[PDB]
């Protein structure tokens, strides 16, 4: 009803229109005043004047102290990175340049640099620019290892916990192990000098590094180690980061009961302190949706990723690596949700964006492309099957064939031959070669995918069961040796009902495989039985599938911070 503009807001537009003359004296304004001047420049679209002062570390130091309006700084920072000027790169270089100049100076001036380094390095870590956050953290780590004092090793351990976080997201896993070993040097030295440093966040970072390298046995071992040292006095951001990456290790360990009590509390705790539109909250949903993706909670797994992406999109601007990873999970979630329907319209668009965002900001040989290009290739595979024109099919399958091996090579270089992810690509290639009519190559790929993934995971695993199903689906159609698939299919249903029950999505293509196997040899005493199994399958999962999201499922949590920790630890 035409409320007059506040004199605070009215005076903001009064100095923005006269920015050029008063440009020098705006930097003398208070921090609460100073931020609103810059946020108005972005709102007016004057990004060039906005970027004319964020390139200085000192100006960006005052702006970083507006903690309430940090969600607006992230949206402005991403706008500059799409505007042109590499404000992330120049700030990191400028901080690293000035950091080395106070090595011989006193610790009073020095301690200010680490405080500046952590807020700036934490912000770039939040903003996703891991390649520039690493150079910030490596500079402040250097200061902490110059003068031997009890406080210096107390923050040197605080650099290595965040150094190991900016190298987990940047796919520098090879250098991640060295940082942990370097962390133990100051951590043990502090422990000897009457200060047992908290090994909770630092042990929590290995819950993602070893998880990324598919060291599930080692990650779950460090999952238990990280969860023990939690404390109610820890920061909530530190606490929620442990729960997310501890829950992920439980999902791949084929344990579902203790995982959901961990990650749901992680969702609840993140939503409480931060809110429903915070980057840390969205980081929990992607880890939370990873649980829903593997427990056959497929209906809300797409929604929880869709909710997760919208949080990052509202805060992280345009071409940001965090949006691409949010795009990545939603692209794959729609891939498995639209499998029967074939509606991979938004699935490819999210996948196309996932390629689009990463290639602009990351190097062409970065490992995150290998994860990103794999899902888009899976989109191209199912699209060519659904398309009617055979000329379209022969081109798109080759395009998907281009992405898998390019993705596989990056996985091979960074993970080694004997790893799940390399064997994960082998399973994809076997299914791909079935569509590519290279059946003999498909047989070679499937046996590679099942003699390596099963070798280290064990005889009982979710992904191993799917890899059997890929080769079981082979012998049914192209090889036509149904005796081989008779034992293979029987393994697929066997592992399917151990954890997922009868009503699992992959088991539908498994029960149908037995009937198709039995239909060739004229067997009918089991076809009639297994037709009743499909009728049981068609109802029982759909009996308990009614629409229900996950944000109200967690709701308020009766479980407290300690009620979740001890329950998971003792069991």
């Amino acid at each position: 009803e035409w409320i007059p503009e506040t004199l605070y807001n009215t005076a903001i537009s009064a100095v923005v229109d006269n920015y050029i003359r008063s440009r020098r004296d705006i930097r003398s304004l208070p921090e609460n005043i100073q931020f609103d001047v810059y946020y108005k420049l972005y709102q007016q679209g004057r990004l060039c004047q906005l970027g004319s002062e964020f390139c200085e570390l000192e100006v960006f130091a005052k702006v970083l102290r507006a903690l309430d309006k940090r969600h607006l700084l992230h949206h402005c920072f991403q706008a500059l990175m799409d505007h042109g000027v590499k404000v992330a790169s120049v700030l990191a270089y400028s901080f690293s340049r000035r950091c080395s100049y106070i090595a011989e100076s006193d610790a009073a001036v020095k301690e200010k640099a680490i405080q500046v380094g952590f807020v700036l390095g934490g912000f770039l870590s939040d903003a996703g620019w891991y390649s520039d956050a690493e150079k910030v953290f490596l500079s402040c780590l250097q200061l902490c290892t110059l003068h031997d004092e009890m406080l210096h090793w107390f923050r040197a351990v605080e650099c290595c916990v965040r150094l190991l976080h900016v190298r987990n997201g940047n796919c520098k896993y090879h250098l991640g192990e060295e940082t942990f070993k370097l962390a133990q040097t100051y951590m043990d030295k502090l422990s000897k000098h009457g200060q047992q440093a908290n090994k909770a966040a630092l042990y929590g970072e290995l819950c993602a590094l070893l998880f990324a390298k598919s060291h599930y046995d080692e990650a779950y071992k460090w999952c238990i180690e990280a969860m023990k040292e939690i404390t109610a006095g820890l920061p909530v951001k530190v606490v929620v980061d442990v729960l997310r990456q501890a829950s992920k290790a439980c999902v791949v360990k084929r344990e579902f009961k203790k995982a959901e009590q961990l990650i749901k509390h992680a969702v609840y705790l993140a939503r409480d302190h931060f809110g429903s539109k915070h980057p840390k909250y969205s980081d929990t949903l992607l880890d939370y949706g990873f649980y829903l993706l593997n427990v056959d909670n497929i209906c809300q797994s797409v929604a929880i990723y869709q909710a997760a992406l919208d949080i990052r999109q509202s805060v992280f601007g345009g071409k940001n690596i965090h949006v691409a990873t949010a795009h990545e999970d939603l692209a794959y979630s729609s891939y498995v949700h639209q499998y029967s329907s074939g509606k991979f319209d938004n699935a490819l668009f999210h996948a196309e964006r996932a390629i689009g965002i990463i290639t602009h900001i990351l190097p062409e040989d970065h490992l995150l492309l290998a994860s990103s290009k794999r899902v888009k290739a899976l989109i191209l595979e199912e699209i060519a099957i659904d398309c009617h024109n055979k000329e379209t099919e022969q081109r798109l399958l080759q395009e998907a064939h281009d992405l898998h091996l390019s993705s596989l090579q990056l996985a091979k270089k960074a993970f080694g031959e004997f790893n799940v992810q390399t064997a994960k690509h082998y399973g994809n290639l076997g299914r791909l070669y079935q569509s590519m009519r290279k059946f003999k190559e498909a047989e070679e790929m499937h046996i590679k995918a099942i003699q390596i993934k099963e070798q280290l995971l064990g005889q009982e695993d979710y992904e191993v069961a799917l890899s059997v199903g890929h080769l079981a689906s082979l012998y049914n159609y192209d090889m036509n040796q149904y005796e081989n698939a008779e034992k293979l299919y029987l393994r697929s249903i066997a592992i399917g009902k151990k954890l997922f029950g009868e009503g699992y999505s992959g088991l539908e293509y498994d029960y149908r495989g037995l009937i198709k196997l039995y239909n060739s040899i004229g067997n009918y005493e089991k076809v009639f039985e297994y037709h009743n199994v499909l009728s049981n399958w068609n109802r029982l999962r759909d009996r308990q599938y009614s629409v229900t999201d996950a944000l109200e499922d967690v709701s308020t949590s009766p479980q407290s911070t300690e009620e979740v920790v001890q329950s998971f630890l003792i069991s």
């Binding site: 794959y332 498995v336 499998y339 199912e382 299914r431 992904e463 293509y509 498994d510």
Partner: peptide, 6 residues
């Protein structure tokens, strides 16, 4: 059925 988990 659909594919391996990512």
């Amino acid at each position: 059925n659909k594919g391996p988990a990512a």
